Structure 1
Amino acid sequence: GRSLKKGPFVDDHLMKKVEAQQGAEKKKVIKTWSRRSTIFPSFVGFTIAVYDGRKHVPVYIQEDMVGHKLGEFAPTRTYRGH
């Protein structure tokens, strides 16, 4: 998969927002279009409203969720059955 040398990936604007909110007693929702961002241990404890193609779905971060792309946690399309 992702080359180890390149290190983990995350959008700079999203990274800046989380860093500014790090010293926050109560984390506020972070509205992002960035599906590409990988989740980080620092990201733990936050709720991120990730765009799903038509709206930002909030998703809560936790230690288990770290290490995966944000966009995965927000399904794009809806299918109920036939």
Structure 2
Amino acid sequence: RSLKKGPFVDDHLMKKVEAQQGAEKKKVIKTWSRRSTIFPSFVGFTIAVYDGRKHVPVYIQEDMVGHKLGEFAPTRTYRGH
């Protein structure tokens, strides 16, 4: 949110991640929420985001916190002409 208020994130995603407290990477989580932000809690998980046709995985690191999830799951398989 570009308003200086709650950095947006979905309740179920927050809930499942916070339940995953031991931070095991095998605890891979899925979501259709391309619109949520990224937090330090996410840093180190392999989440799978629905890109319109598939759950594409992505491993989070420090360089994603201010970004959205949909930025790492593109929707257009362009390959030149």
Gaps of 5+ in 2: none
Query: What TM-score, normalized to structure 2?
Result: 0.90
Structure 1 runs of 4+ aligned residues shifted over 4 Å read none
Gaps of 5+ in 1: none
2 CA distance for matches of 1:70 and 1:24? 19
CA RMSD of aligned residues (A): 1.4
CA distances 1:37-66 after superposition (whole Å, capped 9, x unpaired): 100011001001000001110000001111
2:78 aligned with 1:79, yes or no?
A: yes
Query: What TM-score, normalized to structure 1?
Result: 0.89
- Change over 3 Å in CA distance of 1:56–1:35 after alignment to 2: same
**More displaced stretch, 25-34 vs 49-58:** 25-34
Q: Identity rate of aligned residues, in percent?
A: 100
Written as runs of structure 1 = structure 2, the 5 A alignment for 1:33-44 is 33-44=32-43
